[PDB]
Amino acid sequence: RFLKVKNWETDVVLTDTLHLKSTLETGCTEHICMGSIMLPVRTKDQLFPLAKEFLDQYYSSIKRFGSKAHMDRLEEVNKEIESTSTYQLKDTELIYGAKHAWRNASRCVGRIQWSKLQVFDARDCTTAHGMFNYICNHVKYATNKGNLRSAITIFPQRTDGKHDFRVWNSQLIRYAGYKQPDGSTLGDPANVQFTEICIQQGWKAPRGRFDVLPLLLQANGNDPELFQIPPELVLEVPIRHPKFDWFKDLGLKWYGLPAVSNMLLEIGGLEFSACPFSGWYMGTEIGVRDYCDNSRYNILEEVAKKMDLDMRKTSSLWKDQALVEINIAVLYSFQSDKVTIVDHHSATESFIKHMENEYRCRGGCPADWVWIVPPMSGSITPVFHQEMLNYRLTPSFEYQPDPWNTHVWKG
Amino acid sequence: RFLKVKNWETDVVLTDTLHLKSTLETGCTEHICMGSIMLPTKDQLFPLAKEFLDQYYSSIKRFGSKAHMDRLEEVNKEIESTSTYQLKDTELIYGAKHAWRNASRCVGRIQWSKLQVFDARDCTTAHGMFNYICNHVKYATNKGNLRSAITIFPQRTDGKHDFRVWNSQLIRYAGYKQPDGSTLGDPANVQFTEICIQQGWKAPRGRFDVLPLLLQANGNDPELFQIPPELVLEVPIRHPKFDWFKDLGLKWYGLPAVSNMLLEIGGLEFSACPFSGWYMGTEIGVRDYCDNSRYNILEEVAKKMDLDMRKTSSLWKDQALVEINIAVLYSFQSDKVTIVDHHSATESFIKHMENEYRCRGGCPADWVWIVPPMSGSITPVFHQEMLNYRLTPSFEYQPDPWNTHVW
Numbered sequence: 001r002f003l004k005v006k007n008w009e010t011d012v013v014l015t016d017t018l019h020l021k022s023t024l025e026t027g028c029t030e031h032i033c034m035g036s037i038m039l040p041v042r043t044k045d046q047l048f049p050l051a052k053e054f055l056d057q058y059y060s061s062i063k064r065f066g067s068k069a070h071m072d073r074l075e076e077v078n079k080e081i082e083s084t085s086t087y088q089l090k091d092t093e094l095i096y097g098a099k100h101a102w103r104n105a106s107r108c109v110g111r112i113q114w115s116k117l118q119v120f121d122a123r124d125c126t127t128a129h130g131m132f133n134y135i136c137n138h139v140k141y142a143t144n145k146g147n148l149r150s151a152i153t154i155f156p157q158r159t160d161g162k163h164d165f166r167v168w169n170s171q172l173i174r175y176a177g178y179k180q181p182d183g184s185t186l187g188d189p190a191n192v193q194f195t196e197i198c199i200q201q202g203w204k205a206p207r208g209r210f211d212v213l214p215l216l217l218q219a220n221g222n223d224p225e226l227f228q229i230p231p232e233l234v235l236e237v238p239i240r241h242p243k244f245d246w247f248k249d250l251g252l253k254w255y256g257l258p259a260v261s262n263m264l265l266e267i268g269g270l271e272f273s274a275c276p277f278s279g280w281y282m283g284t285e286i287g288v289r290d291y292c293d294n295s296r297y298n299i300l301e302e303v304a305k306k307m308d309l310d311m312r313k314t315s316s317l318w319k320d321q322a323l324v325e326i327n328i329a330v331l332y333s334f335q336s337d338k339v340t341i342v343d344h345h346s347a348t349e350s351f352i353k354h355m356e357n358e359y360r361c362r363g364g365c366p367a368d369w370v371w372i373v374p375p376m377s378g379s380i381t382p383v384f385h386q387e388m389l390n391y392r393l394t395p396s397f398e399y400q401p402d403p404w405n406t407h408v409w410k411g
Numbered sequence: 412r413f414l415k416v417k418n419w420e421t422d423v424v425l426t427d428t429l430h431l432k433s434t435l436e437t438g439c440t441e442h443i444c445m446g447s448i449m450l451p452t453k454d455q456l457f458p459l460a461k462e463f464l465d466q467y468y469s470s471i472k473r474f475g476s477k478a479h480m481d482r483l484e485e486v487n488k489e490i491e492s493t494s495t496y497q498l499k500d501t502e503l504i505y506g507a508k509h510a511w512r513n514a515s516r517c518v519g520r521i522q523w524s525k526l527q528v529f530d531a532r533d534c535t536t537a538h539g540m541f542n543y544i545c546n547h548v549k550y551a552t553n554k555g556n557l558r559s560a561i562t563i564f565p566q567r568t569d570g571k572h573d574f575r576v577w578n579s580q581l582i583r584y585a586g587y588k589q590p591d592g593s594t595l596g597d598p599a600n601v602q603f604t605e606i607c608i609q610q611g612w613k614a615p616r617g618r619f620d621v622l623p624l625l626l627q628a629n630g631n632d633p634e635l636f637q638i639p640p641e642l643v644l645e646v647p648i649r650h651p652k653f654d655w656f657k658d659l660g661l662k663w664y665g666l667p668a669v670s671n672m673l674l675e676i677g678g679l680e681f682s683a684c685p686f687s688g689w690y691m692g693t694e695i696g697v698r699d700y701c702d703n704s705r706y707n708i709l710e711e712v713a714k715k716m717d718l719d720m721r722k723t724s725s726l727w728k729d730q731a732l733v734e735i736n737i738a739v740l741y742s743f744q745s746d747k748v749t750i751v752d753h754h755s756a757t758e759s760f761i762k763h764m765e766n767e768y769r770c771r772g773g774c775p776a777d778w779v780w781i782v783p784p785m786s787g788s789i790t791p792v793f794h795q796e797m798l799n800y801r802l803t804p805s806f807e808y809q810p811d812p813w814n815t816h817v818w
């Protein structure tokens with residue numbers, strides 16, 4: 001069975017067959033759509049089938065399906081699963097793995113870049129100090145002095161679920177949040193809980209509005225350890241505006257490297273619970289969400305006051321005007337300091353080109369419209385008008401529980 | 412079984428049970444989500460009729476009363492003989508208000524129970540339908556103080572006798588192709604406009620020409636009618652700060668009145684059921700004005716604002732977009748014509764979801780349609796999880812009458 005999707009601006013219609021290769025469940029049924037819900041030890045039994053499916057896909061992509069090398073690899077992986085209950089990916093399969101997980105990530109608008117992903121193999125790592133070293137290199141290579149390069153570092157895969165590697169941070173670079181006694185928050189409200197776990201673990205907090213958190217790193221199931229990232233490795237950008245001189249006086253900055261460190265990477269049934277990855281920013285992530293979400297830095301009012309808009313009635317659209325101002329400032333500041341960034345018009349146009357290409361070369365592109373459409377100016381980007389089909393392929397990036405809720409403490 | 416929805420901005424959590432009363436299907440499967448697809452006999456009629464009367468009687472608190480079982484027998488007999496049945500007035504008003512209540516794509520449902528229902532089931536001809544339509548337009552316009560209403564024509568019987576309004580809205584601007592190659596007026600309505608011209612309409616061929624009504628009674632060829640211009644309230648679009656904005660020569664009409672949907676109540680199909688409320692600002696300023704396939708005026712405005720249009724990253728579109736919408740709101744408010752902004756309408760809708768969760772056990776909502784087409788994340792709906800499901804009575808799409816009719 002085939003499925004068509006229509007772009008309602010261009011009337012271009014595309015035919016999906018890729019959805020047939022999908023297994024994992026979406027969460028919806030014929031009677032209910034869960035398209036807007038934010039969230040979606042494995043046994044030897046369930047493992048060979050998963051490995052086989054992955055190797056069939058790997059060997060197809062390199063035009064060696066059914067080859068002698070294909071059959072021997074399958075034989076060898078099966079022998080390794082029965083003897084040891086798990087197996088080890090070759091380098092090449094890992095690289096292929098990590099690339100396909102990004103390519104398969106239906107909420108990522110940046111997937112046109114999926115095949116340029118520098119993969120660092122940290123599976124020989126055994127200790128939290130080793131993890132810190134691997135993370136510094138990643139950050140140094142990814143940043144590349146403002147000319148960002150996508151990368152991912154992959155720590156040993158899960159074994160019995162009791163020896164897991166985890167990065168306790170949600171991103172490698174993120175600002176502290178502190179709840180004050182009077183109920184206000186200083187710094188970033190999204191990071192208060194984690195900030196508190198750093199303090200308790202012995203971090204001496206500076207207590208400002210923009211303090212880069214320390215790394216909290218768990219090797220082999222052991223209690224996690226604190227490490228400060230060398231500041232010379234943390235590239236940060238002061239935010240100013242090209243026309244409004246008072247903007248600089250709001251004291252805002254952001255860091256340049258967005259580096260998600262809390263997802264789980266699944267490849268051929270193997271689970272990599274520590275797999276930090278990095279790209280570069282679309283401007284709306286910082287300007288709309290980080291700065292203007294009511295539950296984050298929430299600077300809308302302060303900016304509107306300084307612009308002197310009519311804040312007495314919402315129908316003045318003062319909120320909408322202040323928001324476009326902040327986003328202009330964000331992009332202006334990055335471009336001036338020569339730090340890679342993409343605006344939402346350019347990223348969405350890329351994405352539609354990527355999606356057509358994928359329907360042609362691959363037979364489909366899973367895409368999550370709720371996440372792909374940008375959080376400002378949605379209908380003037382071409383993604384608003386594109387029908388999209390969302391389904392789950394592997395390899396994949398998955399959510400996982402916060403480590404502080406599951407970890408057994410040693411003391 | 413019972414499902415939770417969380418608001419990520421405020422952490423309010425609501426539990427949904429109403430979905431277990433869903434009848435129709437979504438288009439999704441647990442393998443594929445279809446959230447973003449725009450559109451996905453005597454035997455059948457009795458369960459449908461029964462379902463409907465069951466919730467009607469329970470709503471007025473007489474479920475399983477003499478009166479309940481009485482009506483159930485009665486409609487049961489009428490189906491068995493006539494192979495259809497007629498709704499009582501009160502059931503008809505209940506059905507229509509609930510079709511709005513259940514419209515998961517509608518952000519304006521906090522108003523659902525203030526709907527004026529006009530019963531036109533005694534209508535027989537296109538002139539009759541015209542008369543009902545003007546009464547509806549004048550009542551709902553109310554000289555700028557807008558009132559929700561729906562007018563209900565006779566229900567489908569054999570499908571060769573259908574009542575239909577061929578317009579997609581009762582008030583819509585014409586669209587013409589040109590020698591030039593591109594489009595004067597509204598591109599959305601280029602097709603319908605030629606059916607009118609190929610019908611007899613003399614078009615003024617302007618940018619903002621109110622379309623004639625094309626009305627079909629009992630399956631006959633449809634007939635043109637001009638709406639008295641005195642019943643068409645229109646707003647000149649000016650800006651509270653930019654003097655040159657008035658010289659763009661833009662206007663829009665006060666009354667949004669969708670006329671091409673099908674109302675389904677207790678298995679009965681009402682294929683002509685035009686209804687109207689009032690605008691959210693973004694429908695005109697974001698979609699009608701700035702869609703690439705619509706009036707598409709973003710560059711013309713950006714220009715007049717002397718913004719740097721050299722690269723996408725100056726956010727000149729975003730800048731021009733805001734100014735346009737400020738002007739729509741300003742104009743409607745200055746001319747005393749009811750309008751709602753996206754901040755206000757979404758804050759209401761969150762209040763409505765809350766009400767519905769506690770009084771009904773849920774509220775079907777379609778996030779893709781409820782989040783406004785500008786500034787999504789600074790509105791509270793953006794952060795609200797929503798469950799989408801299909802309840803009846805309902806409004807449904809139906810195919811264009813020109814693809815189906817015979818001359």
Ligand code: HEM
Binds near residue numbers: 102110111113342347
């Ligand atoms: C190269 C520049 C990139 C850009 C501009 C980009 C853009 C984005 C954006 C804007 C989002 C939504 C984020 C949000 O609203 O919170 C996203 C989601 C995501 N992207 Fe990317 N992306 C990039 C690179 C990458 C890389 C290198 C990977 C992994 C190798 C990745 C995997 C994902 C995943 C897994 C999600 C979904 C996250 C979730 O469900 O919470 N992306 N992408």
Ligand code: HEM
Binds near residue numbers: 511
């Ligand atoms: C009173 C003021 C009202 C407001 C502000 C309002 C708001 C809206 C908006 C903004 C949309 C999406 C529009 C679009 O993007 O095309 C919509 C969809 C809809 N509303 Fe309303 N609404 C109102 C009254 C009504 C009434 C009176 C009814 C019927 C009694 C109704 C039924 C619907 C339906 C069926 C849809 C979805 C149509 C589709 O799937 O194409 N609404 N509403």
Ligand SMILES: Nc1ccc2ccc(CCNCCc3cccc(F)c3)cc2n1
Binds near residue numbers: 038
């Ligand atoms: N620019 C980029 C590049 C890669 C990315 C990869 C992943 C992400 C997503 C990280 N954000 C998670 C935020 C979240 C999600 C779900 C619930 C929450 F409370 C918070 C953003 C990215 N941005």
Ligand SMILES: Nc1ccc2ccc(CCNCCc3cccc(F)c3)cc2n1
Binds near residue numbers: 449
């Ligand atoms: N302000 C209001 C009030 C009631 C409304 C009732 C319905 C509507 C939207 C109806 N339009 C259908 C749009 C559509 C759908 C599918 C294909 C298309 F080309 C166009 C808008 C409303 N706006």
Ligand SMILES: C[C@H](O)[C@H](O)[C@H]1CNc2nc(N)[nH]c(=O)c2N1
Binds near residue numbers: 036
């Ligand atoms: C409730 C809702 O699904 C949730 O707020 C989503 C909406 N769309 C999103 N889209 C992106 N890119 N990022 C997000 O964090 C969200 N949040």
Ligand SMILES: C[C@H](O)[C@H](O)[C@H]1CNc2nc(N)[nH]c(=O)c2N1
Binds near residue numbers: 385
């Ligand atoms: C492809 C996508 O489903 C389509 O553009 C939808 C998106 N969301 C929408 N939301 C509203 N309110 N109105 C619309 O017409 C649309 N169009």
Ligand SMILES: [Zn+2]
Binds near residue numbers: 033444445446
């Ligand atoms: Zn779905």
